[model samples]
Target: LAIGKPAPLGAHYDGQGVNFTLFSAHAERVELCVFDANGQEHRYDLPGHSGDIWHGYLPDARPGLRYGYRVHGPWQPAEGHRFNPAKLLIDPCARQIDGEFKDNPLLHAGHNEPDYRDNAAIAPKCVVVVDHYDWEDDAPPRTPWGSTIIYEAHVKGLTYLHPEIPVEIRGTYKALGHPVMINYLKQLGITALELLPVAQFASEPRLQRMGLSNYWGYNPVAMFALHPAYACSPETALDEFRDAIKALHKAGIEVILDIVLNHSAELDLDGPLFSLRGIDNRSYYWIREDGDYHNWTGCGNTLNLSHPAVVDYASACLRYWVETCHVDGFRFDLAAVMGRTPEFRQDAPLFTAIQNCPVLSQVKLIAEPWDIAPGGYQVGNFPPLFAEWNDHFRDAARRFWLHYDLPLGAFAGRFAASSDVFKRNGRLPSAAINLVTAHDGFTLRDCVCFNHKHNEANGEENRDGTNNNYSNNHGKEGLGGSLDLVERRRDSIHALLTTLLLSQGTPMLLAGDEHGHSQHGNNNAYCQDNQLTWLDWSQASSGLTAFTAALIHLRKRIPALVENRWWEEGDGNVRWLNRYAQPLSTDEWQNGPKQLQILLSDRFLIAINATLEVTEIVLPAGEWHAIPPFAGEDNPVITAVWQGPAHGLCVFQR
Candidate 1:
């Protein structure tokens, strides 16, 4: 109706011909490159244009056609024009992408140069796809924030090593829909599965040089396309991913993707010139005053999301995922970079755009609320509508369990929702997405087994991952500890998991951690695609499974534990006590080393003892019952006086 005021850029399906449009504000010419079913390229110049928009109509173009753009313009980065007609560019509105980029030095702008000039030649082209999916009455689970249990997992790693799944289907979206996998999820009682970067991604050339792949899939290439590798087949990738989502929806589980819109696989100034770099380098990325890249994301150039066109592209991508693939939500990786305009304000245009967008508003929006850039640690500053990954919880819990001597005041504050951080600006406890371990750092087992990170296996000379893990092995470092030490480590892991689940916020569990999965003390397994990082169903012990299942069941049964309400009014629902059941004094919380016991509405009590010997904790003045303890030989009988051992936790129901 508007006759292409903005370049039309999608294969529109009417009763007849499909219209296509693309925008290049400074381009002298634009060509539409079409690919056949076999991926053979065909070129056609767009016939008509309306004020900087290249437009054309294809009478025979249908939904499944693959198309790309080749915009001809001046190739200049000094003055900001980066258009290269030699490289076929991806449609920003593309719903599906076909293949991975084949590494070729010719793709680089200056082939064989050590400086690594811009090379759009090696980038993969985007393909146009039909937006129709027969959802068959599908709708978002819309689970309440208070009761949500998030299982953080990689799309391929979740089922890659599962022996029960078919060999061909393993490690793909089709495997996710397999009955064996879905049944396990259904019984786990988790409300949502937070996938780690399922968007179309490319393996970094550096990692490939090291003979390793980008196993975490964080280096995204196409925001709107599904990763082709995760699909069982090239042609069925979208359908398979869709089927997986449908199956998950049928089981009432929401899917939240970990997105990396902050940066692309194109590394730094010396990195390759991919989609955004070739399309419009200045418009897509935040460049320094001297025309260099702004390395806010630390991975490379930060996206210039402040631009209106960038905002529209981002919003359109969000809408595409929700409307086409039926994804339930998104968790922005390094989300603070999304609001780095002027003074790095949280209420920036990008934040408002996402919060006010009609399609994204209904979905769960989460943020990894920090980056490696200056003034980027904005954990609590995010809008009240968005939930942020609470790194404070991770650090405090680790210090409490491993350090064993930190002041209880800090530990208790973090365990009880970090109200000091989230209470401001009318944020609630649900604003905190509490997690002790995530994909970037140590597994839960490694957190308790090693005090120092052993990441030499990543081939980074032990220089990768965080050095401040705040972890301490009970007695020995790595494996081969005494049986007593093993028991202590197990108890410590249980304590960490318990703290995460029972805290007053949404709980997130790293997949495979439920069964004592370990990276063998490696904190950074981002490139480890082998058994070291995958979920090992075969090696999962029954005791570990039972312990994790019991904890999950307890979390699901107790509304007080999962409820997202704030205790701002000093309500009696939550109270702190010493081992004697008396209210803890400020000095006790500060100086006392034997302080323990957290009473929740008198409904649940978690008692812990950091002493080297067993301690008998006095129960509150109520009918209390000790649930079955996890340790079989050390299991204490259900009694009025609950006794907890050293480095242990006792859960009681009243």
Candidate 2:
């Protein structure tokens, strides 16, 4: 099999020719297959092996050359070897995919236990990218953690129906970096955009059958390549991604990716014969001796990150995105699955390696911080460097505003970065990515509109989404309530938005939340790729957007709000008080800490009343004027002893 020299893995375009290397730890033999424009296949065997890797130098392999591997080995199910010579496998480290991957019987087991139909025509081919980008003196914004406000968005969802974004590249990477969108982001007071998965992902089989798609992009197959569907053109993905990053960097905005490293779209034993499942099933996944896969991710199979080889590939992918794409940071999905040992630990090898790594340490690292596995809820236990997606903050805010059941003391803890959860060791207030709603759940508008999840569009017969949606309709459900009831819903949204923007932790805003974008009570829109999931730019909720923008502008200037230190000192400490301006007692904290008062350095008195009726709040001695717009009934006024409306907020600055 040794026909060429072995060196770096993946196809490297070395000027006139290319060097190809792949790692199939237990492959009996591997053949490189090159394709012509008309899909003619040409097979060539690797010439050398250096430590379980097959490599060769193709003399005629120029830029745009499409190729894949035909891995040949045993097909035993029990022993965990799934190599099939008929399947053309994609390279794990491929920078770009030449063609689209489709669902075909040839891409899986055909008819019997010995199905050997060739998958050359249907398989995705890897391309030889000869990229030489002119960075144009681009420098990352690298906004400080204290001043960072992340905006969670989907590339296609954010711009698919945008009026300013032209039809030619409406839902592409080019649209994300367009001047119109950039200007809007700046106008909205955003510092960073944490985009939902940009990596190469695939739609699920069930979704495809139902004419729906994986819109939120949780199911990724390739670790290194950017999803081609997001590219403006097939051949322009790499260039488009680079240009988008460059454009954002030029505008002093950071781009962060929400990545899923826990599992792939390839389901279980009977799913498909592709990539890692066919390459080395025994090594790539944590399969049992009984031939069953561990379903830790609830996505069929969990990867074996504890394995040294997996650690290397995952680490390399992170480094590649940072070095090549110039992205500012990452928000890992199902992050606990990646850090799983025998048990999920903070000091796991992956966490330590990321913290100690010279390259990754400089970039921001955020974790979803929990998974579906047993003992999987390790929210605040992530190492010091990581900022966790604080579900505690989300739940507390939702309960306070939606259910009106959360105590004031508990709300105060979350408002101040959930010191009970994250204040330990060397971690600071910035360790929390605070928010009320995320991609998987309801929007800010829906949180106050629907009492239950309406996931019938997901084809699950209403039994799929969780029933613990701590949400409520003002009166009649599903829109079109009385004007009185509708006003209450609007008030609840403004109240929640006020709490979110002015909180102590790093605030992460959902892209369409400011405009009151509603999914019509459908909390889980992961499978709706159509207009339901897209942001309706036509209805640009003016008052809500202006208030949200002003709140963001206000937070960035307040040192007491974004300070990294916890409130425990004598002077700078945040003093918690009851509605009567007295010290909140333990009994009050335990039984009903619902209407909490936040006195920041005695310069600001913020009262958040979560009851269904108004609460009387006594302010400080000095004259304080209510901040405009969201000041309930008293904007720009003498805000002493003001009445805080039910499920509403008031901030008065002296």
Candidate 3:
């Protein structure tokens, strides 16, 4: 046993021995517990303490050795220090964590008195990992924000039932980077794959009791460890993930992680003492004036980014995923919590640190941009270094097609890159990550097939998801509708995809939405890991996939659509017109018009009609030919009037 340097945290394997370091600001003492080959326990005290960091070295400890911590401190809940030596805790910086987090009462550091139960065998242990991988000339795509088309996907859901993938490795990281998968993405024409959380997470105890689990990995337990389930084994998780990143990069597709750093899997005080809570709760998490946890994230507790140590730890975690795993970017979940120094501030310490950090500033940074906290709806308020998820874009597109209650001007605002929101502070249209359908809401098919959420399977009596979905069932409740109803739904989906891809902001498509996948109207499918959550590739609509691909292709071909700059009303790049082939009047802009035309760069005419008839919209004065989906065999020239289909989208090129 010897004191080790504490510059780098976590267990590091240096060939001859392992150096274990932890940051615990207010701990009386820290003990290192190691599990032997035969599942026996060995204990040692962390002898070095520098700047509130604890470190210790074992001469012969090598990689593959499992370890944990038993931090000793006062059991004062009101004062916010809950440290019980009886319960074993996972290292916050563990690169590889092995075992399952069983929901046992012994795992809880109690409300009044501490739970004096040694559950070492039940807790997950951290392994000393060797960071070595063969990238083989891997390079990042570095696709500009203007040209990036993000496809948000879940690792298991995307590959678990893919017909071309081998069954043995299906739903794992290896399958995602398989040639079949890369070819699919290449055909889709997306430049980035925004993956859902792959960080190690734990299922809520309540969900486990109901025989369900958190399929979405938002409840992260270890920031550095990859979710072992993705690889089916802890030993191969990191390497498999790195291989997938390399493969994707080789194919010119960047990988963006949907990271959850706003909260830990520890939940509230009544929840389990997984890692942070057991080690040093007050130092890692924000506490209320009355000493209760801050539920800003709506996930029970919020990580305290205000603390300098917490900030450094978070920055290190981001660097590890980028520097070691080679991820191209991150989409932060519940990002409003990141800028909150007890209250939301534009210049939070965490934001400043990331902007100043050399490695972090280069990668793409996206924010969910909102939380459940009061004053947390900061859609366009993030620093210029970050882009934000525009819920306004999602709702307006849904309203135009499904609800049809919004005025034409309301929809046009979003169509023009939401200039009102992101145009300030020299931010470009790309600052708005325009999304019509994300993982949290209804799929594109469900938007035109189900008006209400059918989330009873979530066990919340159908009260779990939002009621304001803005969906339209089209005189039918579910699938298997009349022929006319099916046609209307298909038309609406095409129109929605047309709007999303052609919009000025960067576009993100929900993974299965391309093939018209559905959760059977389960808007909130976070707890369902069955077929309901998995992508049923057999039921995919090849036509819809082709249509989506066409929309993406068409968008890239037009320079105005892909430009990151904002478009002015008279800017030569764009023009908004009424159904009469004339410039929109002030009255027409204010009134809700059923038909509108967008002429882009004076070379493309897009006719949109919401009425239930073959509405005739006068085209701008030009000789234009119909494009695919609207094009005829002869491609007849249209100069004056164009017969746009009802509730349809039509495109013509000049």
TM-score for each candidate, following the candidate numbering: 0.93, 0.96, 0.98
lDDT per residue as tens, model 2, 1-654: 234556565788777578888877888888888888788898988877778778988886788888888888877777777777877888888888766555666767432364677777777788888768777787878898988999999989899999888889888899989999988899889999889898888876777778887888888878888888988975778788788778888888999999988887777776666688777777788887876788888888888876667777787789888988888999998889767876887877777778778999999999999889888888888888899999878888888888877776778878888988889988889999998888878888888778888899999898876677788877767865788888888878888898888889899999899998888888889888887689999876877888898889878667777666777755665778787777788898878647777878677777777788887888757888887555543545686787877788777777
Pairs with steric clashes in candidate 1: 8-21, 107-121, 108-119, 109-118, 109-119
Cα lDDT, all candidates: 0.77, 0.81, 0.88
Give lDDT tens digits, candidate 3, residues 232-325. Answer: 4457888888888888998999999999989998999878889899888889999877668989888989999868899999999999999888
Q: What TM-score would you give candidate 3 relative to the actual structure?
A: 0.98
What is the descending lDDT order? 3, 2, 1
Off by over 4 Å in 3: 632-634, 637-639
Q: State the local distance difference test value for candidate 2.
A: 0.81
Clashes of 2: 7
RMSD in angstroms, all models? Answer: 3.1, 2.0, 1.3
Q: TM-score for model 2?
A: 0.96
The local lDDT score (0 to 100) that residue 494 gets in candidate 3 is 87
